[PDB]
Design a protein around this ligand. Structure first.
Ligand SMILES: *[C@@H]1O[C@H](CO)[C@@H](O)[C@H](O)[C@H]1NC(C)=O
Ligand SMILES: *[C@@H]1O[C@H](CO)[C@@H](O)[C@H](O)[C@H]1NC(C)=O
Ligand SMILES: *[C@@H]1O[C@H](CO)[C@@H](O)[C@H](O)[C@H]1NC(C)=O
Lengths: 75, 111, 495, 120, 75, 49, 49
């Protein structure tokens, strides 16, 4: 819907509070956290897959974070 | 300390009358002094604001005076219309509030 | 004295050889400018009117459906046709239902079916556009005199309001008693209204990106339409349902106002009820102080007694403001104001209400000064009745430097390369920096457009890690610097 | 324009709320104060409020006894008196002044609401 | 928004078609495609970062894909 | 049959009786009488004074 | 001189007008009208039903 394209990285931000700025600052983080709480099984699988795919701990953690962030997002 | 005014003031038409507003340095002399002309059964009308300043649309017969600690309101020419209670208002720093003069009625003669 | 009481006040000191200075005025901010021999002035951008807006698209946020009709072909006879499939005020869909002897075909299979309903709009968003030459900026110039009618007030009794347009971008303000100030502004490079839309939904309005407005997933009209009846993406506000394969229905998708509100996060809300008023954005102006003179420099020191009618109150900017009355004899006179140490051996602070003067006896005048960190004494008057006022400033010079640097970084974060024109007086270092910032900002905006603040933080951390685990020192340092700047921008942005 | 509510008859120990509607410009750019005058007596400032900001200021005499409030949606200013008594019988005015701590010129006044504790 | 938490992956699906199955089937992919078209700059930077972080073509491609899919999502 | 209500969400609301109160700097939080009632959604912020 | 109260702390209270509400298991939270008013201190718990 329109809600899924929320005019954020548009580069028109001045020194004035944007519309729903305070809420939208952490709404996505709250959504990811609630999803990880409600769906522990996918997080464990994502950790296992990130460990398997990545050789260095940095890219393992990066893969885990990207998978966890996009798992609820694709929904 | 608080605003004090003569309870009554007399006069005659075509005269000059000045009403005195005496207070302490906390209220008068450290803040502006406002003069209000109230007719019977009517909301007070702002007469002088700040000090010796007349709101737009007021006749020049009215003139305010500000001393180091006391204030006065002078009338150029007197008439039957001038017979009304006159109040001086000034912010008080110690009292943390606005203090009114207490009232002064101009008793024009010629009855 | 308007900037006193605004947290986003800025102090601009000094002019160039030409007696001009570059200042960027933002709506929520106030600029106070000071030169060696000029009166202190406060500058506020208090309006930005867009005039004569033209609509370019009306989106439908709530529709209804009527006149639903269905057609079908028995299996193997091709797709059906409805007269309404060519009608633009109708939304149609093609599906397959199950047919047979019970349904009334005579052949068993998937027979095509099409259903159409008339699409009607009940509420819409009108995304108006405005020509960049129709913008008008109102700027108030108030002299930082000390006369009581201007101490942080947001009125125009003493302030002078100058209107600036792209066509008449050079204007002068006649400041009674201080000469005139010439403002040479560049509204065209201000906000680039050719790539922006004025979005008015119900009684609320926003300023939005035109590509974002044209990419919205709602149905729209071109804006030249006076009757609707030709909405474009009608399929976005409807859903066709064929549960199993026995029926095909169509329903509307409910008011999209709240979804639009969610989509509008990060867009600065504007006003569009009584004209298109934009209380957001900045204006770069070159300020010309050459015909600007102090009022009363040909006055004699007062030589009388002052009384402090309002105690000294400190502001958010490290300066102090004091309201003093006069009770001496020479009415228009220079006020003997100094900020010294206890022994009155050294001068420690500078006053901001430059050249304070008593215009009238029982007319309080309130001076603004900038006292030093720690102990200092404000001396008002001359010896016969001189008053000495103790003050203490809580901060530190190192802390002040840190706060100045942070304000500079934040200005660069908000104005980008326009932050190199704030307080600018020409110079080659400023020009070199502005060019470098322009190129780097072009690259950075290309690489980070459309990205949220969490994504910026993640990219900054990734780039910083890449740089830190880098074998080459030059590439290591460059990547670490880029990543740290990215992290700072992500932490500062509202995206 | 500054329109006040109608006259009210109350009883001792009760409460009276006086309203004072105002225009949009005067609501968001000015301040509203309440001043009472007992019959045959001088004006007495009770308090005021900057409706855009709220948080009314009250005279020491009326501290704990009065509550001044502003309804931003209706652009109306409210005054409520608790513990009404005979000595509280007087006409109450709502007056408009600039929202600055130094200037107290009430250039615009309401007609005034009279509160009485006896029968009319 | 409520639109950010759709009822997908809840395990209640039957043979009956869902509320907006045809619509919502490809809307996420279309959104990511539109975003990548509108912001080629971030896609190139993501490609460079994915190539740098990942030692193997699989890690690099996975990191690039996840970065591209998550950039609009948090957006 | 015989369903029981589990929760009623709000999808469309209206706001009325908007009021504000402020406290001068350093003097703590301001107070509205309306903060006592749960029918009012309140917010605390800082304003330049 | 001229102090300003910054905060008023309660050192001694009394509870009155106590009321309780419950809902059957699986049927969501119970509701009390008093929970509308912020003068009432409220807590939610579980009981065996
Ligand atoms: C829609 O249906 C109405 C009756 O409900 C009819 O009067 C009207 O002509 C129809 N319009 C169409 C089919 O375009
Ligand atoms: C809300 O305001 C209306 C006036 O519009 C008033 O009648 C009502 O009592 C008020 N209610 C509350 C809870 O403040
Ligand atoms: C509390 O209980 C008393 C005694 O029954 C009653 O008079 C009063 O109205 C009650 N208050 C509330 C808020 O329910």
């Amino acid at each position: 819907s329109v809600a899924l394209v929320p005019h954020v990285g548009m580069g028109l931000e001045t020194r004035t509070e944007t519309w729903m700025s305070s809420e939208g600052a952490w709404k996505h983080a709250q959504r990811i956290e609630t999803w990880v709480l409600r769906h522990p099984g996918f997080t464990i699988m994502a950790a296992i897959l990130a460990y398997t795919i990545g050789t260095t701990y940095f890219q393992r953690v990066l893969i885990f974070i990207l998978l966890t962030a996009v798992a609820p997002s694709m929904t | 300390s608080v605003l004090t005014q003569p309870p009554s003031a007399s006069g005659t038409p075509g005269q000059r009358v000045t009403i005195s507003c005496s207070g302490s340095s906390s209220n008068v002399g450290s803040n502006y002094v406002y003069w209000y002309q109230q007719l019977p059964g009517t909301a007070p009308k702002l007469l002088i604001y700040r000090n010796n300043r007349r709101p737009s649309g007021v006749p020049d017969r009215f003139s305010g005076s500000k001393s180091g600690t006391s204030a006065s309101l002078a009338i150029s020419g007197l008439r039957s219309e001038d017979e009304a209670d006159y109040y001086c208002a000034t912010w008080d720093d110690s009292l943390s509030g606005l203090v009114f003069g207490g009232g002064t009625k101009l008793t024009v003669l010629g009855q | 004295m308007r900037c006193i009481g605004i947290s986003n006040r800025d102090f601009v000191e000094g002019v160039s050889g030409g007696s001009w200075v570059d200042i960027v005025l933002e709506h929520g901010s106030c600029v106070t400018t000071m030169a060696k021999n000029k009166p202190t002035l406060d500058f506020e951008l208090i309006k930005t009117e867009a005039k004569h807006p033209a609509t370019l698209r009306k989106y439908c946020i709530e529709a209804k459906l009527t006149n639903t009709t269905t057609a079908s072909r028995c299996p193997t006879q091709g797709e059906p046709s409805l007269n309404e499939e060519q009608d633009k005020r109708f939304v149609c869909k093609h599906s397959m239902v199950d047919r047979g002897w019970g349904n009334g075909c005579g052949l068993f299979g998937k027979g095509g079916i099409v259903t159409c309903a008339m699409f009607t709009c009940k509420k819409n968003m009108e995304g108006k556009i405005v020509q960049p030459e129709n913008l008008e900026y109102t700027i108030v110039i108030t002299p930082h005199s000390g006369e009581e009618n201007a101490v942080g007030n947001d009125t125009g009794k003493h302030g002078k309001e100058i209107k600036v347009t792209p066509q008449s971008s050079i204007t002068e303000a006649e400041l009674t008693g201080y000469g005139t100030v010439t403002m040479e502004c560049s509204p065209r490079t201000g906000l680039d209204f050719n790539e922006m839309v004025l979005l008015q939904m119900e009684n609320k309005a926003w300023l939005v990106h035109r590509q974002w407005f044209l990419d919205l997933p709602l149905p729209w009209l071109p804006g030249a339409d006076t009757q609707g009846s030709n909405w474009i993406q009608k399929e976005t506000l409807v859903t066709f349902k064929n549960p199993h394969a026995k029926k095909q229905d169509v329903v509307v998708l409910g008011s999209q106002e709240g979804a639009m509100h969610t989509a509008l996060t990060g867009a600065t809300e504007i006003q569009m009820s009584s004209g298109n008023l934009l209380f957001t954005g900045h204006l770069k102006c070159r300020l010309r102080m050459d015909k600007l003179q102090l009022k009363g420099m040909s006055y004699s020191m007062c030589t009388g007694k002052f009384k402090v009618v309002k105690e000294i109150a400190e502001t958010q900017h490290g300066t102090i403001v004091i309201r003093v009355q006069y009770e001496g004899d020479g009415s228009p006179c220079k006020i003997p104001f100094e900020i010294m140490d206890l022994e009155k051996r050294h001068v420690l602070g500078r006053l901001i209400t430059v050249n304070p003067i008593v215009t009238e006896k029982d007319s309080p005048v309130n001076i603004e000064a900038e006292p030093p960190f720690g102990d200092s004494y404000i001396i008002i008057g001359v010896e016969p009745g001189q008053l000495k006022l103790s003050w203490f400033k809580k901060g530190s010079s190192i802390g002040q430097m840190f706060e100045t640097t942070m304000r500079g970084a934040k200005r660069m974060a908000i104005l980008g390369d326009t932050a190199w024109d704030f307080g600018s007086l020409g110079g080659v270092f400023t020009s070199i920096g502005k060019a470098l910032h322009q190129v780097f900002g072009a690259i950075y905006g290309a690489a980070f457009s459309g990205v949220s603040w969490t994504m910026k933080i993640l990219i900054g951390v990734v780039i910083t890690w890449i740089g830190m685990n880098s074998r080459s020192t030059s590439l290591s340092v460059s990547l670490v610097l880029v990543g740290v700047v990215t992290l700072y921008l992500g932490v500062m942005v509202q995206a | 324009q500054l329109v006040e509510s109608g006259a009210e008859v109350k009883k001792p120990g009760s409460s009276v709320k006086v309203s004072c509607k105002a225009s949009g410009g005067t609501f968001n750019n000015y301040a509203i104060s309440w001043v009472r005058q007992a019959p045959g007596q001088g004006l007495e400032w009770m308090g005021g409020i900057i409706p855009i900001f709220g948080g009314a200021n009250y005279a020491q005499k009326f501290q704990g006894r009065v509550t001044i409030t502003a309804d931003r949606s209706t652009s109306t200013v409210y005054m409520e008196l608790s513990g009404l008594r005979s000595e509280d019988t007087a006409v109450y005015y709502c007056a408009r002044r600039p929202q600055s701590i130094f200037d107290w010129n009430f250039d615009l006044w309401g007609r005034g609401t009279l509160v009485t504790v006896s029968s009319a």
